[PDB]
Symmetry: C3
């Protein structure tokens, strides 16, 4: 890059030089079509069924879409036996009583179990008919939420576009990175009917290009959105341009001032020079400039003599006139001009505000480093941008904080494999009891 400004004291004007043209002469259409990723909604019952996220998101969406659509148009021995009989009488009689006691013991236990059973049913029944429904009710609601999120996630680009269009009545400048991806833009450029350097220029300058392009909504249907992107095409590259700035000029033997009217970008076209009257039409990036033919004015290279002379055969030369002294200042790409006339005081101050130059009732130029500020009378002009105060906004990190539920399975299964100890034990006791009795007859 080799940008320079050269100041023309005799015309109180300054030109910035060393820029390279790129001039729109046309447009490249392209038709981008986007499928929605649709949800098929799963009619279950969630926790609270006035809540219907999926239904609702769809409506929200569908509606946006309609909105846009609208834009388009006993008896006892005796003697003996004696005592013995009655020993057995006594023994038997104990046993009877002991057995009755046992019976009532088994009744107790039976009723115990009858109840523990009665209760285990209820435990099951809580689970099956109380908890379990609202577990897998949640399971549903979650499936919904997930679905919704994932709809916005995967349909992101479409949605972004949809908004963009809603907010712009279906037409945008800058072609957002949602309308066109870099990858896309880049290959799209590739496909343009232009020279190879041209392609490379465009590729190394996506920002400008986007700023220079439009996106027009084409057609919206619930499940497809298509729009036309509109890119610039340059009919010339690499011709030199220059920016002209202009400040009033007065004699001193008083009486007359001149300000040259025609400021802006000049920039060579086919053997002739194209002039673009207002910022608007041009953007610039380093030593690269990009302007739009559309409204340009075509003029002869003889325009240039106006930087030196004004009055000179060859070009009448747009100007404005004053009878009275006017003083002021004009900031350029690479310094500033200052026209200090009549009674007015002018000052160039440096980086730290120390005053370096002071102004001899005429028209001078200064530049960055050296000059940071000029004042004319009470107005202050800043030759450089004033740096100040960074602001900083910190973030912490965010916590996926989950804690599983876990069951004593093993220790429990122990207890049980051990209740079976007892039954297994019990049965074997009876087994033994019965043997003894099938030995009685």
């Amino acid at each position: 890059q080799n940008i320079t400004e050269e100041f023309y004291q005799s015309t109180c004007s300054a030109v910035s030089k060393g820029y390279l043209s790129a001039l729109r002469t046309g447009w490249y259409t392209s038709v981008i079509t986007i499928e929605l990723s649709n949800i098929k909604e799963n009619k279950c019952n969630g926790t609270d069924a006035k809540v219907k996220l999926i239904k609702q998101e769809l409506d929200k969406y569908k509606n946006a879409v309609t909105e846009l659509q609208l834009l388009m148009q006993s008896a006892i021995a005796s003697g003996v036996a004696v005592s013995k009989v009655l020993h057995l009488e006594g023994e038997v009689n104990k046993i009877k009583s002991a057995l009755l006691s046992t019976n009532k013991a088994v009744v107790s236990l039976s009723n115990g179990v009858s109840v523990l059973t009665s209760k285990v049913l209820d435990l099951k029944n809580y689970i099956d008919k109380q908890l379990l429904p609202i577990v897998n009710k949640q399971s549903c609601s979650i499936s919904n939420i997930e679905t919704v999120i994932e709809f916005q996630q995967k349909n992101n680009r479409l949605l972004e576009i949809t908004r963009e269009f809603s907010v712009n009545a279906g037409v945008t400048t800058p072609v957002s990175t949602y309308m066109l991806t870099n990858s896309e833009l880049l290959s799209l450029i590739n496909d343009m009917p232009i020279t190879n350097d041209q392609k490379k220029l465009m590729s190394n300058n996506v920002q400008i290009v986007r700023q220079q392009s439009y996106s027009i909504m084409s057609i919206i249907k619930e499940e497809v959105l298509a729009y036309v992107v509109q890119l610039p095409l340059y009919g010339v590259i690499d011709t030199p341009c220059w920016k002209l700035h202009t400040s009033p000029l007065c004699t001193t033997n008083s009486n007359i001032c001149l300000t040259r009217t025609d400021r802006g970008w000049y920039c060579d076209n086919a053997g002739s020079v194209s002039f673009f009257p207002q910022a608007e039409t041009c953007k610039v990036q380093s030593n690269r400039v990009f302007c739009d033919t559309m409204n340009s004015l075509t003029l002869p290279s003889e325009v240039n003599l106006c930087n030196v002379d004004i009055f000179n055969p060859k070009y009448d030369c747009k100007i404005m006139t004053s009878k009275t002294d006017v003083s002021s200042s004009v900031i350029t790409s690479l310094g500033a001009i200052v026209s200090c006339y009549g009674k007015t005081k002018c000052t160039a101050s440096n980086k730290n505000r120390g005053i370096i130059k002071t102004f001899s009732n005429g028209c001078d130029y200064v530049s960055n480093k050296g000059v940071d500020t000029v004042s004319v009378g009470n107005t202050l002009y800043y030759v450089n941008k004033q740096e100040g105060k960074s602001l900083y906004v910190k973030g912490e990190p965010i916590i996926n904080f989950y804690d599983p539920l876990v069951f004593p399975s093993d220790e429990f299964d122990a207890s049980i494999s051990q209740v079976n100890e007892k039954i297994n034990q019990s049965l074997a006791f009876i087994r033994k009891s019965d043997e003894l009795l099938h030995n009685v007859n």
Copy 2:
């Protein structure tokens, strides 16, 4: 649809004709007020209670709002015998019964334990699982609430953003600021003719681009803003667009470019001129301009298309001493001023060159011409089609799987444990009867 261009070789200029005016002369105010749908947050305990969605969403929101706020300012046969055989018998029974007793002990301890355990099962449920089920139940209620807040408050939120990004004023009036339904009935209410209304209705897009929305007042639960719509003081006047290219001469050394380009368009007996694009937009043969900065001029302006020099109108122009060659693209073709040493070329659709340029100033049109080149600069008379780009989507899966319990088969086992108890009791029943027969 009768748009045309007629080229004026003697003024190296072209006019696009057959357009119909609509010219802004005023504004139509309307005050749109929007209620927020507020959440009443339900202080439960969610799964992890550093997480506080509803509280948090509300703050986000509330804050946006503050921000905007700030923008505003039999008895026999020796029997002794039997006795002793009964004595051994008794003695067996004793032992047998003890064995049974120990059996009932075992079972009792079995149950004592199975009981001890069923309690624990219940207790896991009640005091372990059940909290964190209906903790989840809470967090979900929240999430749902949040989502549904964004859903139902959508339009408001969209607006709120729009305003934050635009410091409280927008052009295009979005479909979020104004619905078609709304815009339409609003138009209906405007103090204009009926055709006028119909024009507006059949052109919403332009209208919206021509309208503003200004934020009026924001309160946590209400937002109100003023929409600002255009009003046309005239419809259906012809307009035309003028394009203009340099014109040089021979017998020696003057070049003319007509300065005054843009839209002309008839007003009350006189003609309104709008200097820059900006002011005008156009849809088919319909044009919409803004008086605001217009210049009013006499019909006599028209003779300038033919003559330039002529009594009646001094005529805006710029001057060159030296030959200047170039090209200018029109609505419906192109102009090309080929002068001095420069070479000029019109090529067709496929780039086959059709015309080559006789050192003057000519016009060409679409079909026929696709491209003109002046020296090394290339101009495109038509937009170049290229490469559709396509971006596919699949469809997305609501993927839920219920949990279900063997209820019947379980209830079977149980209604069947009761088999055994019912059975057991009856066995004892029988035993007892036999004993109340012993005395």
Copy 3:
């Protein structure tokens, strides 16, 4: 305040007066840097694991970031009776034994089944409970990422939509807090600071935000604020309408429209003129213009409001040979040039016609005039109010219902099953005593 318009009949032009300047002459850079609040994702298994919200959101985000990055470059004896007795007892005991068998098998089953209940819980339900517990952790994490990273996200978008540079500096790029203190740090006078502070809106509209550098976890951009090198000078707005009543020095007719409309406004002993709206914005009696393309002119310009022709200033004008009639709306009323055959009308609030126009050039004002018509074109001097639109919202329901367990009533049953065992053991206890008394 004190805004006024004074109309100059002899120049068919009107000036609005009493505004106070503020004029851009520099910029103030500041570099804002924003940390992302990052998620450390928790690789669990959720309900359906094709779903991966956190992974997915991050990708969405990370991608936006890459995109932006790319922008940058007879009956019975005893004994016989005892005999029979024993024999009864045997049978009765057998019956008891089979009773204990029944109960044993009953328990054997109830046990068999309680295991299954546990196992459903442990191996069926419990996994999918704390699968949901995971999925929720995720959803929450996602939401909370958008919530806490809100500002950054809003910015990221804004930049994506504008190819990395915006005007209005949104409240998301700069908070009022920030803007305010930023202003405070600017190298300007105190009144100046106060001005800016009482006018945030304009300031914002006058500022730019340029994206500076993007990394996955930090975004930094430069805000660019205006600096005025003069405040509190008077400015005035000039409006201009055609004039057919005129003459110079033996020069009969000619119709004149004064070219140089827009904002004038005093600078260092000279006057700065800003040719198009664009450059200037205004809030009450406060005006804000941009030096950048201004034209510096002598106070003598003002005589042009009175004379046009006068030594001292040649005076930008345009010319017509022919009568041109029209109307021009001003800040505080309207001008109307009614010439030749044309009919002109001022109507009030309700459309009752007040004035009718004597073939010259007049001014009117708000209250009094609401409408002027020139021929068929209608101009609106005031904005037409109409129809408020209203959009209601209800409030939204956090609707949660806890699950609760009969714990007490259950524990009652069980503390009561132990009644029975406790009872049963005691019955055996008593049985055994009786038997260790047999020998």
